[PDB]
Tab-separated table of N, CA, C and O and ligand atoms in Angstrom:
chain	number	residue	atom	x	y	z
S	1	UNK	N	0.814	-1.217	0.000
S	1	UNK	CA	0.000	0.000	0.000
S	1	UNK	C	0.849	1.269	0.000
S	1	UNK	O	1.841	1.373	0.731
S	2	UNK	N	0.458	2.222	-0.841
S	2	UNK	CA	1.083	3.535	-0.873
S	2	UNK	C	0.364	4.484	0.078
S	2	UNK	O	0.766	5.639	0.239
S	3	UNK	N	-0.712	4.015	0.702
S	3	UNK	CA	-1.569	4.936	1.443
S	3	UNK	C	-1.007	5.309	2.810
S	3	UNK	O	-1.062	4.514	3.750
S	4	UNK	N	-0.498	6.534	2.927
S	4	UNK	CA	0.169	6.932	4.154
S	4	UNK	C	-0.673	7.900	4.943
S	4	UNK	O	-0.228	8.427	5.961
S	5	UNK	N	-1.889	8.135	4.465
S	5	UNK	CA	-2.870	8.911	5.211
S	5	UNK	C	-2.994	8.471	6.667
S	5	UNK	O	-2.940	7.278	6.989
S	6	UNK	N	-3.146	9.443	7.553
S	6	UNK	CA	-3.456	9.115	8.922
S	6	UNK	C	-2.646	9.847	9.962
S	6	UNK	O	-1.811	10.704	9.657
S	7	UNK	N	-2.931	9.503	11.209
S	7	UNK	CA	-2.215	10.034	12.356
S	7	UNK	C	-1.366	8.917	12.932
S	7	UNK	O	-1.858	7.831	13.235
S	8	UNK	N	-0.074	9.193	13.052
S	8	UNK	CA	0.912	8.178	13.368
S	8	UNK	C	1.659	8.639	14.606
S	8	UNK	O	1.957	9.832	14.734
S	9	UNK	N	1.939	7.700	15.510
S	9	UNK	CA	2.642	7.982	16.761
S	9	UNK	C	3.969	7.244	16.818
S	9	UNK	O	4.016	6.024	16.628
S	10	UNK	N	5.047	7.975	17.098
S	10	UNK	CA	6.368	7.370	17.138
S	10	UNK	C	6.443	6.270	18.185
S	10	UNK	O	5.938	6.442	19.297
S	11	UNK	N	7.090	5.156	17.830
S	11	UNK	CA	7.295	4.040	18.756
S	11	UNK	C	8.778	3.697	18.851
S	11	UNK	O	9.216	2.976	19.753
S	12	UNK	N	9.555	4.204	17.908
S	12	UNK	CA	10.951	3.819	17.819
S	12	UNK	C	11.712	4.901	17.069
S	12	UNK	O	11.114	5.679	16.325
S	13	UNK	N	13.027	4.939	17.270
S	13	UNK	CA	13.853	6.038	16.801
S	13	UNK	C	15.317	5.698	17.033
S	13	UNK	O	15.857	5.966	18.106
S	14	UNK	N	15.952	5.076	16.050
S	14	UNK	CA	17.359	4.717	16.170
S	14	UNK	C	18.237	5.784	15.517
S	14	UNK	O	18.017	6.161	14.359
S	15	UNK	N	19.208	6.284	16.279
S	15	UNK	CA	20.200	7.228	15.772
S	15	UNK	C	19.632	8.621	15.442
S	15	UNK	O	20.137	9.294	14.550
S	16	UNK	N	18.591	9.043	16.164
S	16	UNK	CA	18.018	10.394	16.001
S	16	UNK	C	19.074	11.447	16.310
S	16	UNK	O	19.257	12.406	15.560
S	17	UNK	N	19.767	11.260	17.425
S	17	UNK	CA	20.871	12.138	17.815
S	17	UNK	C	21.918	12.275	16.711
S	17	UNK	O	22.340	13.384	16.376
S	18	UNK	N	22.332	11.145	16.146
S	18	UNK	CA	23.368	11.138	15.125
S	18	UNK	C	22.928	11.820	13.840
S	18	UNK	O	23.716	12.511	13.207
S	19	UNK	N	21.668	11.630	13.459
S	19	UNK	CA	21.115	12.314	12.293
S	19	UNK	C	21.043	13.824	12.532
S	19	UNK	O	21.485	14.596	11.694
S	20	UNK	N	20.481	14.239	13.672
S	20	UNK	CA	20.457	15.660	14.023
S	20	UNK	C	21.856	16.265	14.074
S	20	UNK	O	22.062	17.410	13.683
S	21	UNK	N	22.807	15.493	14.577
S	21	UNK	CA	24.189	15.942	14.614
S	21	UNK	C	24.727	16.096	13.198
S	21	UNK	O	25.458	17.045	12.908
S	22	UNK	N	24.340	15.191	12.301
S	22	UNK	CA	24.791	15.289	10.911
S	22	UNK	C	24.287	16.562	10.218
S	22	UNK	O	24.891	17.023	9.257
S	23	UNK	N	23.182	17.118	10.717
S	23	UNK	CA	22.606	18.365	10.211
S	23	UNK	C	23.107	19.567	10.994
S	23	UNK	O	22.714	20.709	10.721
S	24	UNK	N	23.960	19.289	11.977
S	24	UNK	CA	24.604	20.309	12.800
S	24	UNK	C	23.581	21.044	13.677
S	24	UNK	O	23.756	22.216	14.020
S	25	UNK	N	22.515	20.343	14.046
S	25	UNK	CA	21.548	20.902	14.987
S	25	UNK	C	22.256	21.071	16.340
S	25	UNK	O	23.013	20.192	16.763
S	26	UNK	N	22.036	22.206	17.001
S	26	UNK	CA	22.836	22.552	18.184
S	26	UNK	C	22.648	21.548	19.315
S	26	UNK	O	21.607	20.900	19.420
S	27	UNK	N	23.666	21.424	20.152
S	27	UNK	CA	23.635	20.486	21.256
S	27	UNK	C	22.397	20.652	22.148
S	27	UNK	O	21.749	19.667	22.492
S	28	UNK	N	22.060	21.888	22.503
S	28	UNK	CA	20.942	22.131	23.414
S	28	UNK	C	19.613	21.681	22.816
S	28	UNK	O	18.742	21.206	23.529
S	29	UNK	N	19.449	21.861	21.511
S	29	UNK	CA	18.224	21.435	20.847
S	29	UNK	C	18.129	19.921	20.819
S	29	UNK	O	17.077	19.361	21.123
S	30	UNK	N	19.222	19.264	20.438
S	30	UNK	CA	19.226	17.808	20.351
S	30	UNK	C	18.955	17.199	21.716
S	30	UNK	O	18.273	16.187	21.816
S	31	UNK	N	19.497	17.811	22.771
S	31	UNK	CA	19.389	17.232	24.112
S	31	UNK	C	17.938	17.111	24.562
S	31	UNK	O	17.553	16.109	25.164
S	32	UNK	N	17.147	18.137	24.253
S	32	UNK	CA	15.711	18.158	24.509
S	32	UNK	C	14.950	17.342	23.460
S	32	UNK	O	14.047	16.563	23.795
S	33	UNK	N	15.313	17.528	22.192
S	33	UNK	CA	14.652	16.818	21.099
S	33	UNK	C	14.585	15.299	21.263
S	33	UNK	O	13.565	14.709	20.914
S	34	UNK	N	15.648	14.681	21.794
S	34	UNK	CA	15.720	13.213	21.950
S	34	UNK	C	14.719	12.662	22.972
S	34	UNK	O	14.441	11.460	22.994
S	35	UNK	N	14.162	13.544	23.794
S	35	UNK	CA	13.209	13.147	24.831
S	35	UNK	C	11.760	13.146	24.357
S	35	UNK	O	10.885	12.555	24.995
S	36	UNK	N	11.492	13.816	23.246
S	36	UNK	CA	10.124	14.142	22.907
S	36	UNK	C	9.378	13.057	22.152
S	36	UNK	O	9.918	12.448	21.225
S	37	UNK	N	8.125	12.845	22.546
S	37	UNK	CA	7.180	12.082	21.731
S	37	UNK	C	6.870	12.851	20.441
S	37	UNK	O	6.781	14.089	20.440
S	38	UNK	N	6.735	12.117	19.339
S	38	UNK	CA	6.398	12.710	18.062
S	38	UNK	C	5.107	12.136	17.489
S	38	UNK	O	4.867	10.927	17.545
S	39	UNK	N	4.285	13.032	16.959
S	39	UNK	CA	3.115	12.673	16.165
S	39	UNK	C	3.325	13.149	14.736
S	39	UNK	O	3.817	14.260	14.500
S	40	UNK	N	2.981	12.288	13.784
S	40	UNK	CA	3.133	12.591	12.372
S	40	UNK	C	1.756	12.517	11.729
S	40	UNK	O	1.095	11.475	11.800
S	41	UNK	N	1.314	13.623	11.131
S	41	UNK	CA	0.014	13.672	10.469
S	41	UNK	C	0.158	13.938	8.977
S	41	UNK	O	0.684	14.982	8.561
S	42	UNK	N	-0.331	12.993	8.179
S	42	UNK	CA	-0.176	13.068	6.733
S	42	UNK	C	-1.544	13.129	6.039
S	42	UNK	O	-2.440	12.311	6.305
S	43	UNK	N	-1.679	14.113	5.171
S	43	UNK	CA	-2.813	14.248	4.280
S	43	UNK	C	-2.320	13.950	2.871
S	43	UNK	O	-1.454	14.649	2.356
S	44	UNK	N	-2.875	12.921	2.244
S	44	UNK	CA	-2.383	12.496	0.936
S	44	UNK	C	-3.533	12.362	-0.038
S	44	UNK	O	-4.423	11.521	0.147
S	45	UNK	N	-3.509	13.196	-1.069
S	45	UNK	CA	-4.511	13.138	-2.123
S	45	UNK	C	-3.844	13.206	-3.489
S	45	UNK	O	-3.410	14.278	-3.936
S	46	UNK	N	-3.788	12.058	-4.154
S	46	UNK	CA	-3.077	11.945	-5.409
S	46	UNK	C	-1.614	12.244	-5.150
S	46	UNK	O	-0.989	11.615	-4.285
S	47	UNK	N	-1.071	13.210	-5.885
S	47	UNK	CA	0.331	13.597	-5.698
S	47	UNK	C	0.515	14.621	-4.597
S	47	UNK	O	1.643	14.920	-4.207
S	48	UNK	N	-0.580	15.193	-4.107
S	48	UNK	CA	-0.463	16.307	-3.171
S	48	UNK	C	-0.342	15.845	-1.731
S	48	UNK	O	-1.295	15.293	-1.175
S	49	UNK	N	0.817	16.077	-1.121
S	49	UNK	CA	0.995	15.734	0.286
S	49	UNK	C	1.085	16.977	1.147
S	49	UNK	O	1.685	17.969	0.743
S	50	UNK	N	0.508	16.905	2.345
S	50	UNK	CA	0.769	17.867	3.411
S	50	UNK	C	1.232	17.065	4.613
S	50	UNK	O	0.481	16.250	5.146
S	51	UNK	N	2.473	17.281	5.028
S	51	UNK	CA	3.067	16.514	6.112
S	51	UNK	C	3.299	17.409	7.324
S	51	UNK	O	3.798	18.525	7.191
S	52	UNK	N	2.896	16.933	8.499
S	52	UNK	CA	3.046	17.699	9.737
S	52	UNK	C	3.584	16.835	10.858
S	52	UNK	O	2.954	15.853	11.256
S	53	UNK	N	4.744	17.215	11.378
S	53	UNK	CA	5.342	16.507	12.498
S	53	UNK	C	5.353	17.426	13.707
S	53	UNK	O	5.885	18.534	13.646
S	54	UNK	N	4.774	16.952	14.805
S	54	UNK	CA	4.598	17.777	15.989
S	54	UNK	C	5.226	17.138	17.229
S	54	UNK	O	5.261	15.915	17.359
S	55	UNK	N	5.735	17.985	18.120
S	55	UNK	CA	6.210	17.570	19.433
S	55	UNK	C	5.909	18.730	20.370
S	55	UNK	O	5.382	19.754	19.941
S	56	UNK	N	6.246	18.590	21.646
S	56	UNK	CA	5.909	19.631	22.614
S	56	UNK	C	6.585	20.983	22.364
S	56	UNK	O	6.038	22.018	22.736
S	57	UNK	N	7.760	20.981	21.734
S	57	UNK	CA	8.543	22.215	21.587
S	57	UNK	C	8.730	22.714	20.155
S	57	UNK	O	8.863	23.920	19.929
S	58	UNK	N	8.773	21.794	19.199
S	58	UNK	CA	9.062	22.144	17.815
S	58	UNK	C	8.177	21.346	16.868
S	58	UNK	O	7.785	20.218	17.179
S	59	UNK	N	7.862	21.933	15.718
S	59	UNK	CA	7.190	21.192	14.654
S	59	UNK	C	8.013	21.279	13.373
S	59	UNK	O	8.936	22.091	13.274
S	60	UNK	N	7.692	20.432	12.401
S	60	UNK	CA	8.256	20.569	11.061
S	60	UNK	C	7.155	20.244	10.072
S	60	UNK	O	6.609	19.137	10.089
S	61	UNK	N	6.821	21.211	9.225
S	61	UNK	CA	5.722	21.055	8.274
S	61	UNK	C	6.200	21.291	6.856
S	61	UNK	O	6.913	22.259	6.581
S	62	UNK	N	5.795	20.406	5.956
S	62	UNK	CA	6.173	20.545	4.559
S	62	UNK	C	5.052	20.060	3.637
S	62	UNK	O	4.401	19.051	3.904
S	63	UNK	N	4.808	20.819	2.575
S	63	UNK	CA	3.891	20.387	1.529
S	63	UNK	C	4.694	20.148	0.271
S	63	UNK	O	5.674	20.853	-0.011
S	64	UNK	N	4.288	19.141	-0.487
S	64	UNK	CA	4.922	18.900	-1.766
S	64	UNK	C	3.998	18.146	-2.699
S	64	UNK	O	2.941	17.653	-2.304
S	65	UNK	N	4.409	18.068	-3.952
S	65	UNK	CA	3.668	17.323	-4.941
S	65	UNK	C	4.622	16.277	-5.459
S	65	UNK	O	5.710	16.619	-5.933
S	66	UNK	N	4.244	15.008	-5.341
S	66	UNK	CA	5.049	13.925	-5.874
S	66	UNK	C	5.347	14.192	-7.333
S	66	UNK	O	4.437	14.514	-8.124
S	67	UNK	N	6.622	14.070	-7.687
S	67	UNK	CA	7.018	14.165	-9.078
S	67	UNK	C	7.367	15.561	-9.531
S	67	UNK	O	7.679	15.756	-10.692
S	68	UNK	N	7.310	16.540	-8.625
S	68	UNK	CA	7.617	17.923	-8.971
S	68	UNK	C	8.762	18.436	-8.102
S	68	UNK	O	8.642	18.519	-6.870
S	69	UNK	N	9.866	18.806	-8.744
S	69	UNK	CA	11.001	19.329	-8.000
S	69	UNK	C	10.627	20.675	-7.389
S	69	UNK	O	9.849	21.439	-7.968
S	70	UNK	N	11.167	20.950	-6.207
S	70	UNK	CA	10.908	22.208	-5.529
S	70	UNK	C	12.139	22.696	-4.789
S	70	UNK	O	12.849	21.919	-4.131
S	71	UNK	N	12.421	23.982	-4.973
S	71	UNK	CA	13.492	24.643	-4.255
S	71	UNK	C	12.989	24.915	-2.863
S	71	UNK	O	11.969	25.569	-2.662
S	72	UNK	N	13.700	24.383	-1.890
S	72	UNK	CA	13.191	24.361	-0.549
S	72	UNK	C	14.164	25.066	0.380
S	72	UNK	O	15.377	24.892	0.268
S	73	UNK	N	13.624	25.883	1.276
S	73	UNK	CA	14.397	26.416	2.392
S	73	UNK	C	13.978	25.634	3.626
S	73	UNK	O	12.781	25.501	3.903
S	74	UNK	N	14.944	25.080	4.358
S	74	UNK	CA	14.591	24.134	5.428
S	74	UNK	C	14.146	24.758	6.763
S	74	UNK	O	13.833	24.031	7.709
S	75	UNK	N	14.113	26.090	6.835
S	75	UNK	CA	13.399	26.808	7.911
S	75	UNK	C	13.586	26.291	9.338
S	75	UNK	O	12.793	25.467	9.803
S	76	UNK	N	14.599	26.764	10.044
S	76	UNK	CA	14.736	26.441	11.473
S	76	UNK	C	15.043	24.969	11.792
S	76	UNK	O	15.439	24.667	12.918
S	77	UNK	N	14.852	24.054	10.838
S	77	UNK	CA	15.490	22.752	10.976
S	77	UNK	C	16.983	23.064	10.955
S	77	UNK	O	17.647	23.012	11.987
S	78	UNK	N	17.508	23.442	9.790
S	78	UNK	CA	18.941	23.701	9.676
S	78	UNK	C	19.261	24.881	8.749
S	78	UNK	O	20.421	25.105	8.393
S	79	UNK	N	18.227	25.618	8.356
S	79	UNK	CA	18.390	26.868	7.615
S	79	UNK	C	19.243	26.769	6.332
S	79	UNK	O	20.006	27.686	6.015
S	80	UNK	N	19.095	25.669	5.589
S	80	UNK	CA	19.811	25.470	4.320
S	80	UNK	C	18.864	25.397	3.134
S	80	UNK	O	17.687	25.053	3.285
S	81	UNK	N	19.380	25.727	1.953
S	81	UNK	CA	18.636	25.585	0.701
S	81	UNK	C	18.932	24.258	0.030
S	81	UNK	O	20.086	23.895	-0.154
S	82	UNK	N	17.882	23.540	-0.346
S	82	UNK	CA	18.038	22.271	-1.050
S	82	UNK	C	17.099	22.199	-2.251
S	82	UNK	O	16.104	22.940	-2.317
S	83	UNK	N	17.428	21.331	-3.214
S	83	UNK	CA	16.524	21.074	-4.336
S	83	UNK	C	15.844	19.759	-4.020
S	83	UNK	O	16.494	18.716	-4.008
S	84	UNK	N	14.553	19.808	-3.713
S	84	UNK	CA	13.874	18.610	-3.215
S	84	UNK	C	13.020	17.928	-4.276
S	84	UNK	O	12.380	18.588	-5.105
S	85	UNK	N	13.007	16.600	-4.236
S	85	UNK	CA	12.176	15.830	-5.136
S	85	UNK	C	11.664	14.598	-4.407
S	85	UNK	O	12.444	13.859	-3.798
S	86	UNK	N	10.353	14.399	-4.448
S	86	UNK	CA	9.722	13.244	-3.831
S	86	UNK	C	9.028	12.399	-4.903
S	86	UNK	O	8.203	12.901	-5.684
S	87	UNK	N	9.400	11.119	-4.956
S	87	UNK	CA	8.910	10.183	-5.964
S	87	UNK	C	8.606	8.813	-5.366
S	87	UNK	O	8.931	8.528	-4.191
S	88	UNK	N	7.980	7.960	-6.166
S	88	UNK	CA	7.713	6.598	-5.709
S	88	UNK	C	8.726	5.599	-6.247
S	88	UNK	O	9.031	5.575	-7.452
S	89	UNK	N	9.220	4.756	-5.351
S	89	UNK	CA	9.920	3.541	-5.765
S	89	UNK	C	9.110	2.352	-5.279
S	89	UNK	O	9.214	1.959	-4.120
S	90	UNK	N	8.273	1.797	-6.147
S	90	UNK	CA	7.303	0.825	-5.688
S	90	UNK	C	6.355	1.487	-4.698
S	90	UNK	O	5.724	2.511	-5.002
S	91	UNK	N	6.255	0.921	-3.499
S	91	UNK	CA	5.419	1.524	-2.471
S	91	UNK	C	6.245	2.293	-1.440
S	91	UNK	O	5.770	2.554	-0.333
S	92	UNK	N	7.483	2.628	-1.798
S	92	UNK	CA	8.319	3.458	-0.950
S	92	UNK	C	8.288	4.890	-1.493
S	92	UNK	O	8.499	5.123	-2.690
S	93	UNK	N	8.008	5.838	-0.611
S	93	UNK	CA	8.070	7.256	-0.972
S	93	UNK	C	9.488	7.755	-0.649
S	93	UNK	O	9.915	7.713	0.507
S	94	UNK	N	10.204	8.209	-1.670
S	94	UNK	CA	11.618	8.562	-1.567
S	94	UNK	C	11.791	10.065	-1.789
S	94	UNK	O	11.374	10.610	-2.821
S	95	UNK	N	12.390	10.737	-0.814
S	95	UNK	CA	12.748	12.139	-0.976
S	95	UNK	C	14.245	12.280	-1.089
S	95	UNK	O	14.990	11.771	-0.228
S	96	UNK	N	14.686	12.944	-2.154
S	96	UNK	CA	16.078	13.381	-2.238
S	96	UNK	C	16.183	14.906	-2.163
S	96	UNK	O	15.469	15.623	-2.864
S	97	UNK	N	17.034	15.384	-1.261
S	97	UNK	CA	17.276	16.813	-1.077
S	97	UNK	C	18.708	17.133	-1.501
S	97	UNK	O	19.639	16.916	-0.729
S	98	UNK	N	18.875	17.629	-2.728
S	98	UNK	CA	20.201	17.936	-3.261
S	98	UNK	C	20.734	19.234	-2.689
S	98	UNK	O	20.065	20.275	-2.764
S	99	UNK	N	21.951	19.186	-2.144
S	99	UNK	CA	22.565	20.381	-1.597
S	99	UNK	C	23.874	20.082	-0.914
S	99	UNK	O	24.542	19.102	-1.255
S	100	UNK	N	24.232	20.914	0.060
S	100	UNK	CA	25.497	20.780	0.781
S	100	UNK	C	25.700	19.383	1.346
S	100	UNK	O	26.730	18.734	1.103
S	101	UNK	N	24.709	18.921	2.105
S	101	UNK	CA	24.775	17.614	2.739
S	101	UNK	C	24.614	16.482	1.733
S	101	UNK	O	23.733	16.514	0.873
S	102	UNK	N	25.471	15.475	1.858
S	102	UNK	CA	25.390	14.290	1.013
S	102	UNK	C	24.352	13.309	1.545
S	102	UNK	O	24.031	13.320	2.733
S	103	UNK	N	23.849	12.452	0.659
S	103	UNK	CA	22.860	11.432	1.003
S	103	UNK	C	21.721	11.981	1.853
S	103	UNK	O	21.304	11.335	2.802
S	104	UNK	N	21.247	13.178	1.535
S	104	UNK	CA	20.226	13.811	2.357
S	104	UNK	C	18.827	13.586	1.787
S	104	UNK	O	18.567	13.826	0.604
S	105	UNK	N	17.942	13.095	2.644
S	105	UNK	CA	16.541	12.998	2.289
S	105	UNK	C	15.861	12.084	3.265
S	105	UNK	O	16.194	12.054	4.451
S	106	UNK	N	14.911	11.320	2.753
S	106	UNK	CA	14.174	10.378	3.578
S	106	UNK	C	13.429	9.349	2.716
S	106	UNK	O	13.362	9.483	1.491
S	107	UNK	N	12.909	8.313	3.365
S	107	UNK	CA	12.034	7.329	2.724
S	107	UNK	C	10.891	7.027	3.691
S	107	UNK	O	11.119	6.876	4.897
S	108	UNK	N	9.660	6.961	3.187
S	108	UNK	CA	8.547	6.528	4.020
S	108	UNK	C	7.890	5.354	3.348
S	108	UNK	O	7.694	5.365	2.138
S	109	UNK	N	7.507	4.356	4.136
S	109	UNK	CA	6.725	3.241	3.607
S	109	UNK	C	5.865	2.618	4.709
S	109	UNK	O	6.177	2.751	5.894
S	110	UNK	N	4.773	1.969	4.305
S	110	UNK	CA	3.862	1.305	5.238
S	110	UNK	C	4.130	-0.201	5.273
S	110	UNK	O	4.333	-0.836	4.222
S	111	UNK	N	4.162	-0.755	6.485
S	111	UNK	CA	4.112	-2.201	6.702
S	111	UNK	C	2.985	-2.457	7.688
S	111	UNK	O	3.067	-2.041	8.854
S	112	UNK	N	1.928	-3.119	7.220
S	112	UNK	CA	0.755	-3.341	8.049
S	112	UNK	C	0.202	-2.016	8.535
S	112	UNK	O	-0.093	-1.134	7.731
S	113	UNK	N	0.073	-1.860	9.847
S	113	UNK	CA	-0.346	-0.576	10.396
S	113	UNK	C	0.811	0.122	11.109
S	113	UNK	O	0.630	0.757	12.145
S	114	UNK	N	2.007	-0.030	10.552
S	114	UNK	CA	3.170	0.730	11.000
S	114	UNK	C	3.742	1.515	9.828
S	114	UNK	O	3.754	1.034	8.686
S	115	UNK	N	4.165	2.745	10.108
S	115	UNK	CA	4.795	3.592	9.096
S	115	UNK	C	6.270	3.693	9.441
S	115	UNK	O	6.633	3.949	10.597
S	116	UNK	N	7.114	3.473	8.443
S	116	UNK	CA	8.548	3.465	8.650
S	116	UNK	C	9.121	4.690	7.988
S	116	UNK	O	8.729	5.036	6.873
S	117	UNK	N	10.036	5.357	8.681
S	117	UNK	CA	10.646	6.565	8.150
S	117	UNK	C	12.146	6.484	8.355
S	117	UNK	O	12.617	6.435	9.493
S	118	UNK	N	12.890	6.426	7.257
S	118	UNK	CA	14.343	6.497	7.330
S	118	UNK	C	14.753	7.905	6.951
S	118	UNK	O	14.399	8.383	5.873
S	119	UNK	N	15.477	8.571	7.847
S	119	UNK	CA	15.976	9.921	7.603
S	119	UNK	C	17.462	9.770	7.384
S	119	UNK	O	18.144	9.102	8.168
S	120	UNK	N	17.964	10.357	6.310
S	120	UNK	CA	19.385	10.248	6.006
S	120	UNK	C	20.058	11.613	5.856
S	120	UNK	O	19.483	12.560	5.330
S	121	UNK	N	21.299	11.691	6.324
S	121	UNK	CA	22.132	12.848	6.095
S	121	UNK	C	23.565	12.368	6.260
S	121	UNK	O	23.890	11.747	7.272
S	122	UNK	N	24.406	12.637	5.268
S	122	UNK	CA	25.794	12.207	5.317
S	122	UNK	C	25.911	10.706	5.455
S	122	UNK	O	25.349	9.964	4.648
S	123	UNK	N	26.640	10.254	6.476
S	123	UNK	CA	26.768	8.824	6.745
S	123	UNK	C	25.851	8.385	7.876
S	123	UNK	O	25.942	7.249	8.353
S	124	UNK	N	24.965	9.280	8.304
S	124	UNK	CA	24.029	8.959	9.371
S	124	UNK	C	22.664	8.535	8.840
S	124	UNK	O	22.093	9.178	7.946
S	125	UNK	N	22.155	7.433	9.376
S	125	UNK	CA	20.804	6.998	9.061
S	125	UNK	C	19.999	6.894	10.342
S	125	UNK	O	20.395	6.219	11.300
S	126	UNK	N	18.864	7.575	10.358
S	126	UNK	CA	17.985	7.544	11.502
S	126	UNK	C	16.736	6.767	11.110
S	126	UNK	O	16.125	7.046	10.076
S	127	UNK	N	16.362	5.776	11.912
S	127	UNK	CA	15.193	4.972	11.572
S	127	UNK	C	14.090	5.107	12.603
S	127	UNK	O	14.280	4.842	13.803
S	128	UNK	N	12.928	5.526	12.121
S	128	UNK	CA	11.779	5.719	12.974
S	128	UNK	C	10.647	4.784	12.556
S	128	UNK	O	10.465	4.478	11.367
S	129	UNK	N	9.916	4.298	13.547
S	129	UNK	CA	8.724	3.504	13.283
S	129	UNK	C	7.560	4.153	14.004
S	129	UNK	O	7.663	4.499	15.184
S	130	UNK	N	6.463	4.352	13.284
S	130	UNK	CA	5.258	4.945	13.842
S	130	UNK	C	4.150	3.904	13.821
S	130	UNK	O	4.142	3.025	12.963
S	131	UNK	N	3.214	4.004	14.756
S	131	UNK	CA	2.026	3.159	14.741
S	131	UNK	C	0.829	4.060	14.458
S	131	UNK	O	0.807	5.207	14.882
S	132	UNK	N	-0.151	3.563	13.713
S	132	UNK	CA	-1.269	4.418	13.322
S	132	UNK	C	-2.211	4.629	14.493
S	132	UNK	O	-2.521	3.683	15.215
S	133	UNK	N	-2.661	5.865	14.696
S	133	UNK	CA	-3.669	6.128	15.722
S	133	UNK	C	-5.038	5.697	15.218
S	133	UNK	O	-5.800	6.512	14.684
O	1	RET	C1	8.473	12.531	5.774
O	1	RET	C2	8.639	12.877	7.185
O	1	RET	C3	9.506	13.858	7.494
O	1	RET	C4	10.273	14.554	6.411
O	1	RET	C5	9.719	14.255	8.897
O	1	RET	C6	10.675	15.121	9.238
O	1	RET	C7	10.796	15.434	10.661
O	1	RET	C8	11.639	16.345	11.168
O	1	RET	C9	12.572	17.143	10.299
O	1	RET	C10	11.633	16.548	12.628
O	1	RET	C11	12.313	17.554	13.176
O	1	RET	C12	12.381	17.877	14.627
O	1	RET	C13	11.307	17.935	15.447
O	1	RET	C14	9.884	17.705	15.012
O	1	RET	C15	11.491	18.266	16.903
O	1	RET	C16	12.744	17.534	17.347
O	1	RET	C17	13.919	18.189	16.644
O	1	RET	C18	13.803	18.139	15.123
O	1	RET	C19	14.249	19.499	14.594
O	1	RET	C20	14.725	17.073	14.542
């Protein structure tokens, strides 16, 4: 299934610190960030996605259209410009963010009622698993 619609709650998070460090997120932010529960809310209609990740202190929101490149400013995540593209590889949603950082982007896919999110930057891979609310 490509259907990633829904409200998802984090259950797992391997190497979050290392991924944030790869983006040069400041020590004080990471120290608090590693403690927080995350909710991920996805609205998916055809190619049009609206993605919202929320926690007690910070959010990250992005809209995109599958198959359409977009010049993106990463806004308070890490304040960098990237050329972003989100496409399908089978039932895996693959984002590549071309810019300063190598191997930067993410992959989302569904297994049963769990959503898997691999976040990549440099040589760091962060793996998150969400369960559907
Ligand atoms: C497809 C799902 C994506 C692209 C989710 C991205 C999520 C983030 C960039 C999360 C960022 C953070 C928070 C929500 C608070 C904890 C600290 C951050 C900045 C890593």
